[PDB]
Amino acid sequence: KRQNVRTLSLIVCTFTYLLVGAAVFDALESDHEMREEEKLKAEEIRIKGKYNISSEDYRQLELVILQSEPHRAGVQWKFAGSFYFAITVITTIGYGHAAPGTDAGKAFCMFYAVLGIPLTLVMFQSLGERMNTFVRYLLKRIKKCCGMRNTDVSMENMVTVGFFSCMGTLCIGAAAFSQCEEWSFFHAYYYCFITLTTIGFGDYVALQTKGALQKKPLYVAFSFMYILVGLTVIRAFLNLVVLRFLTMNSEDERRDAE
Amino acid sequence: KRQNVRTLSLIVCTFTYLLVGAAVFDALESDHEMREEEKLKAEEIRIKGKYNISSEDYRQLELVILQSEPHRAGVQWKFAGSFYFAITVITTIGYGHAAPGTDAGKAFCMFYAVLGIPLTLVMFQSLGERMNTFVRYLLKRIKKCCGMRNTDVSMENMVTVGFFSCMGTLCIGAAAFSQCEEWSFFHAYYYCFITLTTIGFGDYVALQTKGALQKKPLYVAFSFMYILVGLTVIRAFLNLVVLRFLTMNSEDERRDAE
Ligand SMILES: CC(C)CCC[C@@H](C)[C@H]1CC[C@H]2[C@@H]3CC=C4C[C@@H](OC(=O)CCC(=O)O)CC[C@]4(C)[C@H]3CC[C@]12C
Ligand SMILES: CC(C)CCC[C@@H](C)[C@H]1CC[C@H]2[C@@H]3CC=C4C[C@@H](OC(=O)CCC(=O)O)CC[C@]4(C)[C@H]3CC[C@]12C
Ligand SMILES: CC(C)CCC[C@@H](C)[C@H]1CC[C@H]2[C@@H]3CC=C4C[C@@H](OC(=O)CCC(=O)O)CC[C@]4(C)[C@H]3CC[C@]12C
Ligand SMILES: CC(C)CCC[C@@H](C)[C@H]1CC[C@H]2[C@@H]3CC=C4C[C@@H](OC(=O)CCC(=O)O)CC[C@]4(C)[C@H]3CC[C@]12C
Ligand SMILES: CC(C)CCC[C@@H](C)[C@H]1CC[C@H]2[C@@H]3CC=C4C[C@@H](OC(=O)CCC(=O)O)CC[C@]4(C)[C@H]3CC[C@]12C
Ligand SMILES: CC(C)CCC[C@@H](C)[C@H]1CC[C@H]2[C@@H]3CC=C4C[C@@H](OC(=O)CCC(=O)O)CC[C@]4(C)[C@H]3CC[C@]12C
Ligand SMILES: [K+]
Ligand SMILES: [K+]
Ligand SMILES: [K+]
C-alpha cells in the first residue's frame, strides 16, 4: 500500500505545483505580453502602410524572414555546427537553433537519439560517481590534515560541496558567456541554467551571434567542453540529492515479499 | 580500476558517437542548407527591390516579424498557455515557443525549475515502477491462463512489452496530432518522438496553429495528458533497459571494499 500512497502523493504534488506555476507565470507575464503585442502590431501597421506592401507579399516576406533566421547565424551543418547539433541532440538540450530540414535528416535524428541518449546517461552517471568518489576522498584528506576528531565525511558535507560546485559552474559560465556574447551577467546566467538543466528553450544560444562556428574555434571548443562538464556536475549533484528517493518504491516492493 | 576502464570507455564511446553523428548530419543536411539559403536570399532581394525598402526599415521589419511570431499563435501567458509552459519547464521539454520576457519571469523560471525537476523525476520514476509491476503481474496472469509450463516472467518479456508500449504510444500520438494539426503522419511521429525524449526542438509544437489554447479545451487536455503519460511510458522503458548499467560503478566501488 505505502508505495501507492507515495505515488498518489507525488501525482497530487505535481499537479498542485503545475497549478501554482501557471498562476504565477500568468501573474508575471500576461501584462507584458499584451503591451508588447500592441507595440508590435502598431509598428507592423506603420511599416506596411509606409511602403503599401501587398498582403500576399507581406505573408511571403514573413515566411522568408522566419526561414532566413537559421541562416543569418552562419553555416549550421558544416562539421562544427553538425557537432554542436549532435551535442544538443544526445544530451537532450535541443535548442532547435537548427533542426534537420530533410526527412532523411529527421529519420536519422530519431535513430541517432535512440542510441545516443542511453549512452550519454550511462556516461554522465559514471562520471558523476567517479567525481563524487574523488570529492569524498579529498574531503577525507582535508579533514585528516585539519586534525579533526573524525575524518568521516557526512552527507551534509557532500551536499554542501555539490551545491557550491553547481553555483561555481553557473557563475563561471555566466562570466564567460557574458564576456563572449555581450549578454548581461543575468542573461548569461539564465542561459547557463537553462542549458545545464537541459531545458534548452533556445531563446539564448551561444556561437550564433556571428560566424563564430567558423571563425572562433577556441570559443567553440570552450562551449562544447563547458556543456559536457557542466552537465556532469549538475547531474552528479541531482543524483546525490534524489537517489535516496528514486529507489523507495522498489525497495518497498522488495521488502513487501516478506 | 575496472570502474576507471569503464568510464574511459564510455567517454571514448561518447566522443566517437559525436564524431560519427557530426559527419552523417553534415552528409545529409549541408547541400539542402546551401540550396535553401540561395533561394531565400534571392526572394529577399526580389521583395526588397520591388518595394525599395530602406535597409533600416528592413532591419526593423525583420525584428518586428521575428518578435511577432510568438504572438501569432494566440495568447501564450493566460492560464492555459501558462500551464503548457510550466509543463515544458518541469519536464525539461522546453520547446521555447514562449519563454519569459521579463527578468522577474526569468528568475521565477529558475527557482520554479529548481524544485520542479526533482519532483517530476521522482514522480515519473514511481509511476514507472508501479507500471512495470502491474505489467509483470498481468503477464504472470496471462501465462498462467495460457497454461504455460512456467508462469515466470523473464526480462526479455518485459523488454518486449516495453518496446511495443513505446511504439504504440508514438503511433497513437502520431495519429492524433496528424489529424488535429494537419501534419503528415511522419512529421507528427517525429514531433511525438522529439517531445517524449524531452529533446523538444520546438520546430513542431502542438496547440499553436490557431487560438487552440483558448478555443479547443478538450484538445488542450489531450495534449497535456498525452505528454505526461507518454513521458511516463518512455521513462519506464528507459529505466528498465539501462538500470543494470547505471548502478555498475557504485556496485564495483562497494565490492572494492572487500
Ligand atoms: C577531455 C578529453 C577526454 C576529451 C577532449 C575533447 C576535446 C579536445 C575535443 C572534443 C570536441 C572537439 C571540437 C569539435 C569541433 C571543433 C570545430 C572545429 O572547427 C571547424 O571544423 C570549423 C568548421 C569547418 O570547417 O567545418 C575546430 C575544432 C573543434 C573546436 C574541436 C576542438 C577539440 C574538441 C573540443
Ligand atoms: C534504449 C535502447 C533502445 C538502447 C539501450 C542501449 C544501452 C543498453 C547501451 C548503449 C551504450 C552501451 C554502453 C556502451 C559502453 C559500455 C562500456 C563497457 O565497458 C567495458 O566493457 C570495459 C571493460 C569492463 O568493464 O570490464 C561496458 C558496457 C557499456 C557500459 C555499455 C552498456 C550498454 C549501453 C548503455
Ligand atoms: C576559477 C578556476 C578555479 C576555474 C575556472 C577557470 C576559468 C578562469 C577559465 C576556465 C576555461 C577558460 C576559458 C577557455 C576558453 C576561452 C575561449 C576564448 O575565446 C577566444 O579567445 C575567442 C577567439 C578565438 O576563439 O579564436 C576566450 C577565453 C575563454 C572564454 C576562457 C576564459 C577563462 C576560463 C573560463
Ligand atoms: C489522471 C488524474 C490523476 C489527473 C487528471 C488531470 C486532468 C483532468 C487535468 C490536468 C490539467 C487540466 C487542464 C489544464 C488547463 C486547461 C485549460 C482550460 O482552458 C482555459 O483555461 C482557457 C484559457 C483561459 O481562459 O485562461 C480548460 C481546461 C484544461 C484543458 C484542463 C483540463 C483538465 C486537465 C487536463
Ligand atoms: C535538487 C534540490 C535543489 C531539490 C531537491 C528536492 C527533492 C529532494 C524533493 C522535491 C519533491 C520531494 C518529494 C515530494 C513528495 C513526496 C511524497 C512523500 O510521500 C509520503 O509522505 C507518503 C506517506 C509515506 O510514504 O509514508 C514522500 C517524500 C516525497 C517523495 C518527496 C521527497 C523529496 C523530494 C523529491
Ligand atoms: C487503441 C486504444 C487501446 C488506446 C488509444 C485510444 C485512442 C483511440 C484515443 C485515446 C484518447 C483519444 C483522444 C482524446 C481527445 C481528443 C481531442 C479531440 O479534440 C477535439 O474534439 C477538438 C475540439 C475541441 O477540443 O473542442 C479530438 C479527439 C481526440 C484527439 C481523441 C482521439 C482518440 C484518442 C487518441
Ligand atoms: K527549444
Ligand atoms: K531534456
Ligand atoms: K529540451
Side-chain angles (χ1 to χ4, degrees), chain A residues 1-30 32-33 36 38 40 42-53 57-58 60-61 63-71 73-139 142-143 145 147-148 153-155 157-181 183-209 211-243 245-250 252 257, chain B residues 1-30 32-33 36 38 40 42-53 57-58 60-61 63-71 73-139 142-143 145 147-148 153-155 157-181 183-209 211-243 245-250 252 257:
Chain A
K1 194 174 182 180
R2 194 177 189 171
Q3 318 95 320
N4 302 343
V5 180
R6 195 183 297 108
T7 68
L8 292 169
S9 302
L10 282 160
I11 293 163
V12 171
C13 289
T14 300
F15 285 114
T16 303
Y17 200 72
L18 287 171
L19 289 169
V20 170
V24 179
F25 286 122
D26 179 8
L28 290 175
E29 294 285 311
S30 291
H32 178 269
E33 182 180 25
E36 182 165 43
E38 285 174 11
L40 292 168
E43 195 63 30
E44 171 179 336
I45 289 166
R46 174 179 172 272
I47 297 172
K48 193 189 305 177
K50 180 180 179 181
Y51 295 104
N52 195 28
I53 305 180
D57 292 347
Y58 197 93
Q60 188 59 29
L61 183 58
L63 265 55
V64 168
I65 285 166
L66 287 164
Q67 292 172 3
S68 186
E69 201 270 324
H71 302 87
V75 182
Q76 304 284 13
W77 294 102
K78 291 295 184 179
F79 181 85
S82 268
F83 202 101
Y84 192 29
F85 178 74
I87 291 169
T88 72
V89 175
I90 71 176
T91 61
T92 75
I93 296 161
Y95 294 130
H97 60 287
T102 68
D103 293 351
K106 287 181 170 66
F108 181 66
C109 184
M110 295 191 278
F111 292 114
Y112 185 74
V114 164
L115 303 177
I117 294 166
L119 172 63
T120 302
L121 290 171
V122 176
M123 188 274 303
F124 288 142
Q125 184 95 7
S126 302
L127 268 175
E129 182 279 331
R130 293 288 79 204
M131 175 184 290
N132 284 338
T133 299
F134 179 71
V135 170
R136 194 169 309 244
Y137 165 81
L138 189 65
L139 284 166
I142 290 162
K143 282 183 168 285
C145 183
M148 301 195 185
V153 182
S154 63
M155 182 56 64
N157 284 106
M158 292 301 297
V159 167
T160 301
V161 173
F163 175 74
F164 291 124
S165 302
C166 298
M167 293 301 295
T169 299
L170 297 173
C171 294
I172 288 160
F177 291 113
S178 60
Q179 293 292 339
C180 295
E181 299 291 346
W183 301 330
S184 70
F185 188 90
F186 177 68
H187 294 164
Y189 191 101
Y190 167 83
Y191 169 67
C192 294
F193 180 93
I194 291 299
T195 297
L196 301 186
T197 55
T198 72
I199 296 164
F201 299 135
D203 50 355
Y204 297 82
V205 184
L207 311 171
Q208 300 284 285
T209 60
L213 286 169
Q214 289 75 39
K215 298 177 184 182
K216 299 187 176 183
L218 191 65
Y219 176 43
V220 177
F222 167 75
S223 303
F224 295 176
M225 296 304 296
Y226 178 83
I227 289 166
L228 300 173
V229 174
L231 289 168
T232 301
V233 177
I234 299 309
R235 287 174 177 272
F237 174 65
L238 176 65
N239 292 327
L240 180 77
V241 170
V242 306
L243 179 65
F245 308 103
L246 295 177
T247 57
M248 284 182 170
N249 261 45
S250 54
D252 293 340
Chain B
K1 194 175 182 180
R2 194 177 189 171
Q3 318 95 320
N4 302 343
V5 180
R6 195 183 297 108
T7 68
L8 292 169
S9 302
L10 282 160
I11 293 163
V12 171
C13 289
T14 300
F15 285 114
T16 303
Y17 200 72
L18 287 171
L19 289 169
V20 170
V24 179
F25 286 122
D26 179 8
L28 290 175
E29 294 285 311
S30 291
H32 178 269
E33 182 180 25
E36 182 165 43
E38 285 174 11
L40 292 168
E43 195 63 30
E44 171 179 336
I45 289 166
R46 174 179 172 272
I47 297 172
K48 193 189 305 177
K50 180 180 179 181
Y51 295 104
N52 195 28
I53 305 180
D57 292 347
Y58 197 93
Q60 188 59 29
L61 183 58
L63 265 55
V64 168
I65 285 166
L66 287 164
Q67 292 172 3
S68 186
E69 201 270 324
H71 302 87
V75 182
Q76 304 284 13
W77 294 102
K78 292 295 184 179
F79 181 85
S82 268
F83 202 101
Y84 192 29
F85 178 74
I87 291 169
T88 72
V89 175
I90 71 176
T91 61
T92 75
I93 296 161
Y95 294 130
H97 60 287
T102 68
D103 293 351
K106 287 181 170 66
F108 181 66
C109 184
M110 295 191 278
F111 292 114
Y112 185 74
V114 164
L115 303 177
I117 294 166
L119 172 63
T120 302
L121 290 171
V122 176
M123 188 274 303
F124 288 142
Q125 184 95 7
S126 302
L127 268 175
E129 182 279 331
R130 293 288 79 204
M131 175 184 290
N132 284 338
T133 299
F134 179 71
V135 170
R136 194 169 309 244
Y137 166 81
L138 189 65
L139 284 166
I142 290 162
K143 282 183 168 285
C145 183
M148 301 195 185
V153 182
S154 63
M155 182 56 64
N157 284 106
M158 292 301 297
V159 167
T160 301
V161 173
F163 175 74
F164 291 124
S165 302
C166 298
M167 293 301 295
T169 299
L170 297 173
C171 294
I172 288 160
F177 291 113
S178 60
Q179 293 292 339
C180 295
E181 299 291 346
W183 301 330
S184 70
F185 188 90
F186 177 68
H187 294 164
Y189 191 101
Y190 167 83
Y191 169 67
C192 294
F193 180 93
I194 291 299
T195 297
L196 301 186
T197 55
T198 72
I199 296 164
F201 299 135
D203 50 355
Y204 297 82
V205 184
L207 311 171
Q208 300 284 285
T209 60
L213 286 169
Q214 289 75 39
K215 298 177 184 182
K216 299 187 176 183
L218 191 65
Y219 176 43
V220 177
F222 167 76
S223 303
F224 295 176
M225 296 304 296
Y226 178 83
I227 289 166
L228 300 173
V229 174
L231 289 168
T232 301
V233 177
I234 299 309
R235 287 174 177 272
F237 174 65
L238 176 65
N239 292 327
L240 180 77
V241 170
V242 306
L243 179 65
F245 308 103
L246 295 177
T247 57
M248 284 182 170
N249 261 45
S250 54
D252 293 340

